[PDB]
Design a protein around this ligand. Structure first.
Ligand SMILES: CNC(=O)c1cc(C(=O)N[C@H]2C[C@@H]2C)cc([C@@H](O)c2ccccc2)n1
Length: 113
């Protein structure tokens, strides 16, 4: 019932939206951990020290791992940051990251106080 639980419900709402059909055209690369081997990205885990994806964020939310909205936001932004760090800015995945991050940031900003 407290503020932290309430803010985490808003976070859970955002997470459900990021995983929803509405955003699937650009969200799908972020659904599961990057399979570096399958994608031929044999330097991925040398460059990205802390992989993150929405299935991992969902597991952590379901497990009550996140103690506050800030911790949840840090993982969602880590996921985007990894994309911007690894990929050349002209790869389609970077455009898709930017579009999904726009959805995230605008709704995260509507956090209940
Ligand atoms: C989070 N996902 C990724 O960072 C990623 C990277 C690459 C990739 O090959 N990156 C090489 C350009 C770099 C050296 C490919 C994919 C793949 O899921 C994908 C294909 C086509 C449109 C969108 C996504 N995802």
């Amino acid at each position: 019932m407290g503020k932290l639980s309430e803010q985490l419900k808003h976070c859970n709402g955002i997470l459900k939206e990021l995983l929803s059909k509405k955003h699937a055209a650009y969200a799908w690369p972020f659904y599961k951990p990057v399979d570096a081997s399958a994608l031929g990205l044999h330097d991925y885990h040398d460059i990205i020290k802390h992989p993150m994806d929405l299935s991992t964020v969902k597991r952590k939310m379901e497990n009550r791992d996140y103690r506050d909205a800030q911790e949840f936001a840090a993982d969602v932004r880590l996921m985007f940051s990894n994309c911007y760090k690894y990929n050349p800015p002209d790869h389609d995945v970077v455009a898709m990251a930017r579009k999904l991050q726009d959805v995230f940031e605008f709704r995260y900003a509507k956090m209940p106080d």
